Design a protein around this ligand. Structure first.
Ligand SMILES: Nc1ncnc2c1ncn2[C@@H]1O[C@H](CSCC[C@H](N)C(=O)O)[C@@H](O)[C@H]1O
Lengths: 152, 408, 40, 17
């Protein structure tokens, strides 16, 4: 029922389900909270998604990789490059592979037309030893040269 | 106080290499019922970069150009030899093993060649696991018509080549290379099972070569290997290098990836073996019932892109399942558990139907292997192949069950 | 391999009186070099 | 020669317990 409510973009309903689990004695695991985060992120709500992640950390549960991927994708869609970098650092602290999230964030920043922040994030990742896909390399080169940015 | 408190290989095997500038560091050669292998004689401490394990000089190899024209490095074939005429008539694309077999026979007939001595440590006709030496009875136990047909085609091609080029009128220097057909069949089997292809630079010439490398074919195959081959062009030496930063314990086998991204069927066709943890195996599903790829990866901790799945019960079988199971993805759409349970039930039903299609089971196959006393190597190879397929399907079933368990 | 490009140049050229003034700006008007007595 | 070719989340958010 919680995953249903998350699929119809109803974070409030997911909160009702979580409180129902609390009343029933069922401890809220990472899956239900991940559904809450996804429900908040689907309807472009960054503050609510970060509040749900704060509930994650307060509840003592380890957030799933999909939760962090959704958060970084939302930050890239909104152009919040620094928020995405903070989420990537949190992923690194939690012993997670941040390559996929880095690629997703860079691609989202490019799509939303934030070429400056996309370039900065991509260069941070590349100088950090991370390797991007061939398609991402070609996209970065072509977009930067179309914008007249020869340095990047 | 000091007072109060698999067999080793033939020493001559390494000694003949050692006197010819072959060096092995931190590893020793061991022999078992399955065959030869390379194992760490001590604890290899992980260093900053890759560590040198073995060094094989170029002059001890039998290499031929992978592309037309055929030029051998080092040039052992004299000008005007009929063996060059036999080699030059092969098909450039599919007849690469025939040329290597011809070179192997020619080297075995050469008095000063190194492979005259090293060829005594190659597996014999009754010890080689290649399917070219398998009879019709052994092929019947593969339980795969496609592999059987491929093996029959390969055997027919090899025998046709031998009959065409080793007729009555050939000179004595050619007839003694392979007096009768099964010798050439064994040569082709050895070439297929031990050839290494690489892009090597010699002097200023860069080219691809098909290489019979002594002491490097000794390494066994793995899809998660701890060693890799690097060619050193300045002194023309092939290096066996352990992975950088990867600790190796004493007695751990030295393994390299014979060929990446190849399923068990192609491994059985080429090297005559298969592995149960093949992360590229494919099971043909109907595709009507699908599960969530992201949840499956996250439950079993499988990260990376689809071409680089890796694990932080979970082995290459789980990766192969994730690569072959029908999956759906919608960016960030979560899966509702109810459809997942039905999907995994349908997939488990399909897997059980596939298991029922096989006349026997895997545990009975293992019991038959343990009770086996008068069977050829190819017989056990086919039994192991079918048993490994059965264990792969069973692991798929168990992985689906535990994934549906941990979905809540 | 992309070459590590380095584009450095130097060019001579005939100078203009305005650039001479810009160099000086500052005109030497007397031929005296140093004081005979005070060495200033 | 040698000159050729130019030569914080997860903090302040722990489980209260
Ligand atoms: N992981 C593995 N498990 C079982 N057999 C393997 C294997 N990797 C390689 N082989 C077998 O070893 C052969 C490669 S030559 C490797 C050494 C060989 N076993 C010997 O004693 O001379 C192949 O024919 C293959 O059948």
């Amino acid at each position: 029922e919680l995953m249903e409510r998350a699929r119809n973009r109803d974070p409030s309903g997911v909160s009702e389900v979580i409180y129902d689990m609390i009343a029933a004695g069922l401890s809220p695991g990472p899956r239900s909270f991940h559904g809450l985060v996804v429900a908040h992120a689907l309807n472009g709500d960054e503050q609510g998604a970060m509040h749900s992640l704060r509930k994650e950390l307060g509840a003592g549960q380890r957030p799933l990789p999909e939760t962090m991927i959704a958060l970084v994708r939302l930050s890239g869609s909104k152009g919040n490059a620094q928020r995405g970098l903070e989420l990537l650092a949190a992923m690194e602290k939690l012993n997670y592979d941040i390559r996929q999230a880095w690629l997703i964030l860079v691609e989202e920043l490019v799509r939303t037309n934030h070429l400056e922040e996309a370039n900065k994030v991509f260069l941070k990742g590349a100088r950090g030893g991370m390797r991007a896909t061939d398609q991402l390399y070609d996209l970065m080169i072509e977009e930067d040269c179309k914008a007249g940015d020869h340095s990047n | 106080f000091p007072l109060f408190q698999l067999e080793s290989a033939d020493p001559d095997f390494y000694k003949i290499g050692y006197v010819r500038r072959v060096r092995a560091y931190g590893v020793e050669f061991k022999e078992g019922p399955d065959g030869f292998g390379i194992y760490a004689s001590k604890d290899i401490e992980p260093r900053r970069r890759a560590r040198v394990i073995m060094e094989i000089p170029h002059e001890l190899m039998i290499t031929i150009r992978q592309k037309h024209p055929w030029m051998f490095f080092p040039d052992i074939v004299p000008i005007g030899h009929p063996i060059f005429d036999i080699i030059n008539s092969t098909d450039p694309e599919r007849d690469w093993d025939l040329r290597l077999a011809c070179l192997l026979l020619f080297s075995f007939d050469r008095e000063d060649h190194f492979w005259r001595l090293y060829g005594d440590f190659l597996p014999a006709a009754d010890e080689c696991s290649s399917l070219l030496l398998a009879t019709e009875e052994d092929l019947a136990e593969l339980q795969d018509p496609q592999l059987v047909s491929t093996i029959r085609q390969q055997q027919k091609r090899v025998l046709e080549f031998w009959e065409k080029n080793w007729h009555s009128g050939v000179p004595l220097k050619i007839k003694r290379l392979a007096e009768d057909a099964e010798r050439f069949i064994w040569a082709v089997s050895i070439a297929q099972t031990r050839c290494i292809s690489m892009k090597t630079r010699i002097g200023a010439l860069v080219q691809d070569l098909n290489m019979m490398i002594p002491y490097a074919d000794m390494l066994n195959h793995s899809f998660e290997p701890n060693c890799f081959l690097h060619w050193r062009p300045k002194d023309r030496i092939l290096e066996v290098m352990s992975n950088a930063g990867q600790a190796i314990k004493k007695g751990e086998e030295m393994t390299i990836n014979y060929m990446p991204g190849q399923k068990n069927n192609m491994l059985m066709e080429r090297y005559g073996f298969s592995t149960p943890v093949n992360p590229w195996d494919a099971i043909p599903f109907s595709g009507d019932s699908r599960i969530h790829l992201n949840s499956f990866l996250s439950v079993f901790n499988i990260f990376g892109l689809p071409e680089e799945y890796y694990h932080d019960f979970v082995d290459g079988a789980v990766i192969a399942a994730a690569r072959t199971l029908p999956t759906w993805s919608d960016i960030d759409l979560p899966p509702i558990p109810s459809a997942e349970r039905k999907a995994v039930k349908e997939l488990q039903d399909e897997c059980r139907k596939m298991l029922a299609e096989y006349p026997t089971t895997s545990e009975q196959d293992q019991k038959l292997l343990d009770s086996l006393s008068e069977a050829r190597t190819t017989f056990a190879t086919a039994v192991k192949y079918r048993m490994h397929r059965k264990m792969f399907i069973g692991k798929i079933i168990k992985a689906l069950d535990i994934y549906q368990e941990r979905l809540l | 391999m992309i070459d590590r490009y380095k584009h450095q140049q130097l060019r001579i050229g005939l100078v203009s009186p305005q650039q001479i003034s810009a160099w000086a700006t500052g005109e030497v008007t007397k031929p005296y070099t140093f004081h005979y007595k005070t060495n200033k | 020669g040698t000159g050729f070719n130019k030569g914080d989340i997860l903090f302040y958010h722990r489980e209260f317990c």
